Structure formats: C-alpha cells, structure tokens
Paper text:
In contrast, NPC harbors promiscuous activities, hydrolyzing major membrane phospholipids, such as glycosyl inositol phosphoryl ceramide (GIPC), phosphatidylcholine (PC), phosphatidylethanolamine (PE), and phosphatidylserine (PS). NPC4 is divided into a phosphoesterase domain (PD) and a C-terminal domain (CTD), and is structurally distinct from other characterized phospholipases. Mechanistically, CTD contributes NPC4 activity mainly via CTDα1-PD interaction, which ultimately stabilizes the catalytic pocket in PD.
A structure of this crystal was determined at 2.1 Å resolution. By collecting crystals of the determined NPC41–415 structure, SDS-PAGE results shown that the protein was partially degraded during crystallization, possibly resulting in the omitted CTD in the crystal. Comparing the crystallizing conditions of NPC41–496 and NPC41–415 structures, KH2PO4 was absent in the NPC41–415 crystallization. Superposing the determined structure of NPC41–415 to NPC41–496, the architectures of PD are basically the same but with a significant local conformational change in a loop (including residues 250–268). Correspondingly, other active site residues are deflected to a certain extent.
Numbering used by the authors:
A (entry chain A), B (entry chain B): 12 to 258, 264 to 415
The structure:
Amino acid sequence: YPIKTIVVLVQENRSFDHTLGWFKELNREIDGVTKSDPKSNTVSSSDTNSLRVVFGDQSQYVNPDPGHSIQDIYEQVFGKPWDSGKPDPNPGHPNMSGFAQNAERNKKGMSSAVMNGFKPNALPVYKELVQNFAICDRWFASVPASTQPNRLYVHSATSHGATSNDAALLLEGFPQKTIFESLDEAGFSFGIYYQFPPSTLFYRNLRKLKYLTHFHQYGIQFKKDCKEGKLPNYVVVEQRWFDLLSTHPSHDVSEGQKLVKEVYEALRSSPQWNEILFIITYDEHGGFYDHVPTPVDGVPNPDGILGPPPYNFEFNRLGVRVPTFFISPWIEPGTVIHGPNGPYPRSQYEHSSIPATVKTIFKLKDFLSKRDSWAGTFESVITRDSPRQDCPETLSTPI
Amino acid sequence: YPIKTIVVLVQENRSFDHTLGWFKELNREIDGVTKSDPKSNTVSSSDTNSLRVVFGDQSQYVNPDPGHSIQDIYEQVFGKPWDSGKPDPNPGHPNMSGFAQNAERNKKGMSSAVMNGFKPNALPVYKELVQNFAICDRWFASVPASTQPNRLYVHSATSHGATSNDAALLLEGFPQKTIFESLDEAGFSFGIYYQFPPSTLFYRNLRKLKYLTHFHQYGIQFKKDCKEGKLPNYVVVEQRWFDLLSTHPSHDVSEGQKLVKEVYEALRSSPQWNEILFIITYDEHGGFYDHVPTPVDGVPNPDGILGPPPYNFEFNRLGVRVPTFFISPWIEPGTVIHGPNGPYPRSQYEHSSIPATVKTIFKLKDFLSKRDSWAGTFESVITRDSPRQDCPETLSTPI
C-alpha cells in the first residue's frame, strides 16, 4: 500500500451544490444539479407571500457570508425555525427547504447568493482537479453547526460538546485526544503548516511542549519540506485565522483557489508525490444551498457529550454536504465516490472519515470516538497498480 | 479636566536611545546620547581582542530582532550572563554594559544593530510628533523580560507571575483584574480596535460575553468612530498578531511609522480631538542599547507572585527605558517629562503608569495592584488653558 504521506486542507463555508453541483453536466455520475430538473426554495416576506427561487449557476466570485449557526442550519435543513418556547430538536423531516428563507431572514436579498452555484469554467482549478482525480458527492460536515465544532471533528472525530464558536472555550482549549496523538504514540510523524494563528491551537493537548514543535510557519517550511521530500506522515495546511471576536461581510472565492493550486503544485513536484494522498474538504457548507437531506438515522454521538442550551444538541444528525476531493497519482481520473461501504449499514462519509482513514492506513490501534469508529473510510480510492505518470504538473490560474 | 478619551498604542521592541536618543541634539533636555561623549559597550570573542562598539546613529530601517528574553536582558543590564549553577538574581549593579556582548552571543555581528540609533530625520513621523507634543525620557518597560509580560502590565499593572511568552499560559489566559473592568464598573466605556488577533485576549476576564462586544475590527470601526466622535473613554489600538508558536528574523520600522501616522491623523481630524489624550509606548526595548540603569531600588512586586524557574523573578527590577509619547492639543509642544513627582520617592514612570493615570483622570476608586499604586502618573502633562488649534493636520510620509 503506497500511501505514506496524508495531506489535509480544510477550506471554508461552502456547500457541495454551490461549489460542484453544476459539474454534473461534466459527469452525470456526480450527484449535482441540472437546469432541466432544477432545485428550488421558496421565500416569504412582508411584501410577497411566496416567491420560488431556483438554484442557478450564476454564483459571483464575491459573496456575503450566509448564516451557518446551529440555529440557522436548523431552519435550512428542516424548513422551519428553531423555537425555544416550543423546542423541536428532532422534527424528523430534513427536506432542505429553508436555505432561501434563512438567507433572507439573515440579510435581505441574500437568497440570490445562497441559491446559486459556480459554472465549472468559473473555477478552473477545481474543474481540473475533479477531472484528473476523485471527489466524494456524499460527504457531510460532521455537525449542523458553525466552523469550529466541525474543525474540531477533522482531527479528533468529536467537538467535545461544542456547537458554537465559543471564544472562551476555544482559547481554554478542547482536551480530547487528537489524531496527532494517535500518530505520535505509534511512532509516526505529523506537521501543521500555518499562516495565521491556526485553529488547531484550540486542541489543548497540542499545547504540550513536545507538540508545539510540530507547528511550522507555512511560508518558511511548507514548500521547502515538499521540495526535499521531508513531509511528515500527516500534513495539515492551515491558512486563515478564525476571527474569535466576530460576534455578513463579503469575500472572494479566488483566494482559496489560489491556495489549492499552490498546495497541489508543491505536492505534485515533490519526490513524495508517489506516496501522497491529498484530501481537500470544507469545514461546513456556509449556509449555501444543497439538495441532499442531512442524515438523521443511525448517527452516533461521539462521546456522550451534549451541546449547550438551548439546543442541547445530541449530535444525532450530520451537517450539510460539502465538496471533498481525493488527489493522488494512485487514483483513476474522474472518479466519484458516493456513500461508503462503511463499517455499518448507516455509516456515512464525514469529517471523522479523515481520522478513521488515517487510523486505517497507518494501522493505528484505536479509533478516537464512536464517530470515527462509525464513519466510512476511503482508503479504497487508492486503486492503481502503478502511480499515474502524467498527472497535471500545473493547474490553471484562477480567473 | 478636559481629557475624556484616552487612547493607547503599544509598539514593539525598541529602546529609548535607539529610537529617540539622537534627538538630544534637537532638545538638550532629552536624556539621550551625543557624538562627543558617546556611549559604548565592549565585546569579548575567541579570535579577536576586546573591542569597543560605540553607540552611533546609523540604524537602518531593517534590522534583525535582538535578544529580549529575561535571560538576555539580565546579561544586557548587569554585564554578565545568568548562571543557574550560581544564581545571582539581585547582583546590585545595573551598569548597562552587556548589550553588545549579549547581541554577539545571540548572533555574530548583531552588536552593530544593537549599538546604533536613528537619526531624527530618518523617522519623520516621530520627529514631528516629538516636536509638536510631549515625550517621557524616563519611562521603563515594566519587566526586564519579553513582549507579553510587559503587554500584560499595560492594561493590568501586573503580569501575574509571567516572565516569558508561554503559549499554553497565554491561551489559558491571565485572570487578574484589568483597567477595562475598573472602567466598566465605574460606568465608563472602553473599546479595543484590533487588526489581527489581539494580545488583550490573553486577559481571561475579557473573554466574558459582556466584554467580548467591546472588541472592534480596526479596519471596520476605528476611522468610523473617529469621524462620528463616538470613541469610548479608553481606546486601545491593537495592530500585530503575536506568533505564539515562534519558539532573529528581520523586520522594518517603517510599518510602525505608517500605523502611527494613520492613527494620529484619524484622531486629529476627529470631533473628539479636544478631549483626547493619546499615549504611544513600546512593550519593551527589544534588546537594543540604552544607557539609563534599570531601577532596582524600591520597585514593588505587584501582587506577590514570583516568576517561573529558574529565574523565580521577584518583579523587584524594572525593564529597560522605552520611547513614550504623550499627544494632545492640551500639551505644550516640545515637552519632555523626566521622572515622576511622587506618589513615592522611588516611584518611576513605567507601563503601570497608564492604568495609574487612567485611575487618576477618571477618579476610579481603586488601583489594580501595588505597581499601579506606586507608578508615576502623568496627568500633569495636560497644562494648557485652551486646546491648541494649529496642531499638524497631517504628518510626513515615512521615508
């Protein structure tokens, strides 16, 4: 089994249908969207009783940040708002009908951004990566909540009860065991390449003296370690600082495309390219539309810890589908992975799939929680007998 | 008393003589340096004989970062290194003779940068601020240690035992009472205007919900509140993110001049200009040379907490002199404040002077610590009967 280096890049706040849904005309196998059988959500307002908003392919490069709190996402997936005076934590029916309404509730006119996705040619970096490697069109954010609970799952398969971006809790640090500790204890290496203060600092255990040395400034160390073949066994690329103090500004998809291109090309020209498995995913969907109902059946709480009031979240429902890419010369081009042949009938691909698959590939002894123990593993995406030799050396520049 | 808004900007890593020492030619009253009676430090090395390095005015805009740990500063001020096998915490004799030796010890050739200051004309923003307002030439960093223990003093008059930049300790947060809490309890407002993640988040008490709302993005909110005269009673401008993971890279003094210019002009064109007292100081001296012996007599420990081993620091010695500016239309131009007039015979101006003076100007009930209660207060710098009306509207662009 050729994979010795696993590289993880977690992007920000985009749904599958918004990012890749229109890539379906390039490959019908992609569970995306079409113009002929279009998806839609309705909007109610004081001025109008009902307006149908069709999911289109007119996403602009610059967009506001839609709502992605646990309470926003409740309205998006169930089509009705949370009501603390009439609490309905498990209403049963994720029909994905509330994205446009939740957008409008948060900011008038924002349903246009929420109800649009990108044309493939507007994201050439992604179009090339989809066509030359693999994606998963059934990969759900771990939590129907915001950025940090999901990021906590990426490297620990739990959020240790968190469903918000609680500045005090994040700074105090979350104490659960991380995949870094599993790897280290088994003698494997790991490195976190950061630009700004990384969200991985929110793991309290990584603040031990012996683990703080595994953080490396990205600009200094990343391209260098790629060039001389010195990448550790588990590489995390951390790019943005999370504004802990941000108690719906616009921003550009282009920066993320540039980062993906740079990271890919550095891995692609590395002597370790033939041992590398590169995963790109999104922390959560950002409030953008997606048509696939979030799983509500057979989803385990990772550690028995409930979320804070008023939601008292049971972690018995997944988040919304996000774009996930698998990139390796050992992968056939244009491959699309759906649900797992996961260990259980109701297993799903989600962020805990990353620690699960790391545990599987490196034969670590134990899973971290009940979530990585249950999540699908994607090591079977590595299918070739020999590494492909003509993988693109460079990708197109973002528009 | 005309002062209703106090604004604080803390710059990084520069000594008084390095920044303002050559202004003595412009104002003989300044305790600076001359060419005819020059300061010097000696260097001992293996290959070469003892070499005198004279303090010159040849500072370049780009310099390395000299040593400014508690152990480096011990050698700088006492002229001998710390010795854990022969510990000498209170050697008696701050002769300021070790800056060049300590520089060479950290990086060969670095004594040249450490033993140089700026020509006044090389820093036009500062030269204009000095000539149009006030400086203090006897203001000491609170701690002969690194960045964060000193920044803790600026808004709390203690470091709660800290003598290093301990990432785990900083993220856990320091729990001492802050001047923000003194102000809030007395009905006054405060605002922290930050660009990147602010060091004030290291105060644990500011992570409460009711205080997190007082943080404002600088780019969004600062110039705005300056225009509409909506500045709170205590303004902190936070500009740089401290890399907690940095376990001697070069950087440019020009960025700090640009920031100072931007902040000054925004306060100067504000309707609140006639009620504003703006203080600029430096967290500590960065390891650059200064000739004034650090006070070792009558310096109180703020709260009885000792520093960590091996130094077990008693907080009975001040840090090195830093540049400090007082800026307000109620200030006589070209004013230089020396040591304080009380509250005690051995009182000194230092970072705790900021909380002390805030307590004095706003008649807050209690000081925060024994340092606060002992430090000099500079309210007497406000001397005019009417606000000056021809304060510079704009400043020179940095070279």
